[PDB]
Paper text:
Whereas mice only express CD1d, humans express a functionally diverse family of CD1 antigen presenting molecules, namely CD1a, CD1b, [name], and CD1d. Here we focus on mycoketides, a class of mycobacterial lipids presented by [name]. Certain T cell responses to MPM require both a phosphate and a β-linked mannose unit, which protrude from the ligand binding groove of [name]. To determine the mechanism of epitope display, we determined binary crystal structures of [name]-MPM-1, -MPM-2, and MPM-3 at 1.7, 2.0, and 2.1 Å, respectively.
Author numbering:
A (entry chain B): 1 to 104
B (entry chain A): 6 to 281
Write the structure that this text describes.
Amino acid sequence: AIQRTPKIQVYSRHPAENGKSNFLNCYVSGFHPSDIEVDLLKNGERIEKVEHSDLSFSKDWSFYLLYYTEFTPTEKDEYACRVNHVTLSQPKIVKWDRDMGSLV
Amino acid sequence: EHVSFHVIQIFSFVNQSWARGQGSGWLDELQTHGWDSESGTIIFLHQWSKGQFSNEELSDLELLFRFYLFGLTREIQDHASQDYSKYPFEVQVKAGCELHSGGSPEGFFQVAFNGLDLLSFQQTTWVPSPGCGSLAQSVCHLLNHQYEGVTETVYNLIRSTCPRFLLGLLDAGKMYVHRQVRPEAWLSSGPSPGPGRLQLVCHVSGFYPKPVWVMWMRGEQEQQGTQLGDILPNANGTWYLRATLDVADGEAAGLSCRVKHSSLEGQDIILYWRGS
Ligand SMILES: CCCCCCC[C@H](C)CCC[C@@H](C)CCC[C@@H](C)CCC[C@H](C)CCC[C@@H](C)CCCOP(=O)(O)C[C@@H]1O[C@H](CO)[C@@H](O)[C@H](O)[C@@H]1O
Ligand SMILES: CCCCCCCCCCCCCCCC(=O)OC[C@@H](O)CO
Ligand SMILES: *[C@@H]1O[C@H](CO)[C@@H](O)[C@H](O)[C@H]1NC(C)=O
Ligand SMILES: CCCCCCCCCCCC
């Protein structure tokens, strides 16, 4: 007590071009407490081979994590960042808009 | 200018018999060290992460950190008795130092409880945060009287060992911490801002260091609607920034995105919107 709700931002490291190797990032920030589930998704399924930064926190003591995975976009493929946390009733899926990204 | 080295810890107490402890070392925003909990050892993340320290000094510190993690967890689990309505709870520690141009170093040791300031270390004394009442004062009493050798060790680490280490760590990593990394940019269309309106997006990614300038342009005329987002982290030490522009129907042709960054030095990136 108290508890703060994760903010979820999804963006690519390089221009989203089908068939080109790229990196998908999910930056999850501003949450408390640290217990959290963050997963990168391809077509609904957790991406098993991902990287994440070690847990860190801001001056206000809220935590942040950076997730990233190498991925090759295609036209059919859908990418997302899913986050569960005590402040969240349902897991929250933020879908990766290829053109815009998904920031707040 | 000032540079910070932070050793942070996170202790998550789930119940009377299960806690977990995490920890890392950060040079400003760049993680330089991890902690391996199953072997209780330092993870050196860069080839230069040992700074100018010998393996002997680092082994000493490693043993000190593992003793610290275990003994802090144990004393907290002891003193949290059978009050299992108080679980789960979470303790954060941020300790370290800052080098300053022209000033003496700063050393700090700050503790949070459930995300609120609890207490800090002030030269010789554990000081309860005014905004955390009874518990803070209680913990500080114990820290000030029961654990005095721990306290002189802490003083020495944050005021003497930490800046010495940080100086050697900057020097060992000098070819990296002062790097200049050029960004790339690309354009895309964004969600509709409204009927008869379009949103253009200029993505700038892969720059270091963090200061950056981005504007939408028509020729040499900067555009009023330019809006920059947050500077967001990439992996491998670069950053990302989105700059959008809302434009009325039938006016996107001729717009460009212009990027200035220290790494370009008089080679602004200029990207023309090609459609639409
Ligand atoms: C954990 C995250 C890791 C991240 C990786 C980071 C890796 C990098 C490389 C770090 C290097 C950077 C560094 C140079 C900068 C350091 C700055 C900052 C860390 C300050 C933090 C101070 C520490 C955490 C608090 C522990 C002090 C207590 C524990 C004192 C206890 C000892 O004191 P003591 O000797 O008196 C007890 C003795 O106990 C014996 C047995 O019973 C008795 O025999 C004996 O007589 C005594 O009683
Ligand atoms: C053996 C040395 C290892 C390093 C650890 C030294 C620090 C030990 C910290 C001790 C934890 C203190 C918990 C205090 C809880 C308490 O006793 O206060 C309860 C109040 O709520 C009652 O007013
Ligand atoms: C404490 O929590 C751990 C982690 O979930 C669990 O394995 C263990 O059974 C718990 N201990 C209890 C409830 O006594
Ligand atoms: C709920 C039990 C108390 C939790 C807060 C203890 C913080 C101790 C920090 C000491 C640092 C060496």
